[PDB]
């Protein structure tokens, strides 16, 4: 029934993949409230849809800045993928549109804030806590990879916690639909697989390595490979010597040695049994995979929420007025968005 659910999901995906939704809303339909994050091309804001009163998160991207940093194709990947997928732990795109200056993606507002914020504040998660999150990523990646999708930026910063304490993956700027191999040097230093660092040509297995990094970081409170400069992080990653905190259970340690495996013939998620090597590992014995999917498992943590449109689970960022030029910028580059 896994294989069955996955064949149906693929059919659904491909219809949207081959005929993407375009221009399904407009800027004046939304009141902009507050910035929930930024990057070099723009920001994600809390907005209110005026015709329904619903709250959303709206990603705004400056077309000229995207072009200047040569991320046109990656940006087109993000929107095309996000509009096509459908999974409980993938943030849901509601609308997208563009104007003379900017690109816009309006997705579900996930009010519990980033995993990153809670993880840093609390210090670390217990094994059951980390396992509950890990299970959701395992299933999400099973779904994405079945669609030939590689995510390529797994990290607590990109995992938003919803009202029920479940995860929603965000920020698909490096997600790509690929059969066989790809070569872009992209990702976050702490989470890069050795094969990326070594310009090797790589596949979906880099997502399974990143899962090992995430699980370690959630359970230890810090990642397996860190240093003050990225070059020193890369040196640690290629050497591959991981040390585990004394409080890690031997099952956890065993899982992580199989995920953080430099050898692709040995790395879990990449063997003959695929994701089942992970799902059936002993660290995951208490996990009911169908209950996770159905969100029937009780979350070990649920964030405080004081009304719709409240942002206390988010950091504060400098605000900036949206400006729409009277001349169309980069029309050709983004025609398909």
């Amino acid at each position: 029934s896994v294989k069955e659910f996955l064949a149906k999901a693929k059919e659904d995906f491909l219809k949207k993949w081959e005929n993407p939704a375009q221009n399904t809303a407009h800027l004046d339909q939304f009141e902009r409230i507050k910035t929930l994050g930024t990057g070099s091309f723009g920001r994600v804001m809390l907005v209110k849809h005026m015709e329904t009163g619903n709250h959303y998160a709206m990603k705004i991207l400056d077309k000229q800045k995207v072009v200047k940093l040569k991320q046109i194709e990656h940006t087109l990947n993000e929107k095309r993928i996000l509009q096509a997928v459908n999974f409980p732990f993938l943030v849901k795109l509601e609308f997208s549109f563009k104007d003379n200056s900017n690109l816009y993606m309006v997705m579900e507002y996930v009010p519990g804030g980033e995993m990153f914020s809670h993880l840093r504040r609390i210090g670390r998660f217990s094994e059951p806590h980390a396992r509950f999150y890990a299970a959701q990523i395992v299933l999400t990646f099973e779904y994405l990879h079945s669609l030939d999708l590689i995510y390529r930026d797994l990290k607590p910063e990109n995992l938003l916690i919803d009202q029920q304490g479940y995860i929603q993956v965000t920020d698909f700027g490096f997600a790509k639909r690929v059969k066989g191999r790809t070569w872009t040097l992209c990702g976050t230093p702490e989470y890069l697989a050795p094969e990326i660092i070594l310009s090797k040509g790589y596949n979906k297995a880099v997502d399974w390595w990143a899962l090992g990094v995430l699980i370690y970081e959630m359970a230890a409170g810090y990642p397996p490979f860190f240093a003050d400069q990225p070059i020193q992080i890369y040196e640690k990653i290629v050497s591959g010597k991981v040390r585990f905190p004394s409080h890690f259970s031997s099952d956890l340690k065993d899982l992580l040695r199989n995920l953080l495996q430099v050898d692709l013939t040995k790395r879990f998620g990449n063997l003959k049994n695929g994701v089942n090597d992970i799902k059936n590992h002993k660290w995951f014995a208490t996990t009911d995979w169908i209950a996770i999917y159905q969100r029937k498992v009780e979350a070990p943590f649920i964030p405080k929420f004081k009304g719709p449109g409240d942002t206390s689970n988010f950091d504060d960022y400098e605000e900036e007025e949206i400006r729409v030029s009277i001349n169309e910028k980069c029309g050709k580059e983004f025609s398909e968005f």
Binding site: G173, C186, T188, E190, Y222
Partner: peptide, 20 residues
């Protein structure tokens, strides 16, 4: 401790993906 080394590092804030 490793924890102390991490907290004193420049890598405890929100981490950016890389570019070239």
């Amino acid at each position: 401790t490793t924890y102390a080394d991490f907290i004193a590092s420049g890598r405890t804030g929100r981490r950016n993906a890389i570019h070239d």
